[PDB]
């Protein structure tokens, strides 16, 4: 597989690992999203240590308003992060 293909699979993998912990196995609840961010984005995002930060992050990502982050919403989050880093690294 190419680096791009492996990246696609990694995105699916990490979402699977975290979404499947509790409740709906295909959505991230607050606790699952928090742990995904804290364990897997520790170099890109500040560690979440406050309930109010958990709440605001979910509120921002939950565009369909069901209180959880589904795969499409997770991809939008990944796009946000990647775009920020693209602009940072390319000086855009």
Ligand X SMILES: *C[C@H]1C(=O)[C@]23[C@H](O)[C@H]1CC[C@H]2[C@@]12CO[C@]3(O)[C@@H](O)[C@@H]1C(C)(C)CC[C@@H]2O
Closest to 40 in 3D by CA, of 72, 62, 18, 12: 18
CA distance 37 to 15: 11
Between 5 and 44, how does the x/- string for binding to Ca ion read (CB under 5 A)? Answer: --------------x--xxx--------------------
Structure-token match 């984005």, residue found: 41
Interface of this chain with its own copies, residues 71 to 90, rule: CB under 8 A? 71-72, 75-76, 78-79, 81-83, 85-86, 89-90
Tokens (6 digits) for 33: 């999203």
14 binding its own copies? (CB under 8 A): yes
Apex CA 33: angle with CA 32 and CA 35, to 5°? 65
Query: In the complex, which residues of this chain contact ligand X (CB under 6 A)?
Result: 44, 84-85, 88
Annotated binding site: 16, 19, 22, 24, 26, 62, 64, 66, 68, 73, 86, 91
Annotated binding site for Ca(2+): 19, 22, 24, 62, 64, 66, 68, 73
């Amino acid at each position: 597989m190419s680096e791009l293909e492996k990246a696609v699979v990694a995105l699916i993998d990490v979402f699977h690992q975290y979404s499947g912990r509790e409740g709906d196995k295909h959505k991230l609840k607050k606790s699952e999203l928090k742990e995904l961010i804290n364990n897997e984005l520790s170099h890109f995002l500040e560690e979440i240590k406050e309930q109010e930060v958990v709440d605001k992050v979910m509120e921002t990502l939950d565009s369909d308003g069901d209180g959880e982050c589904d795969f499409q919403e997770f991809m939008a989050f990944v796009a946000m992060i990647t775009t920020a880093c693209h602009e940072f690294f390319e000086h855009e």
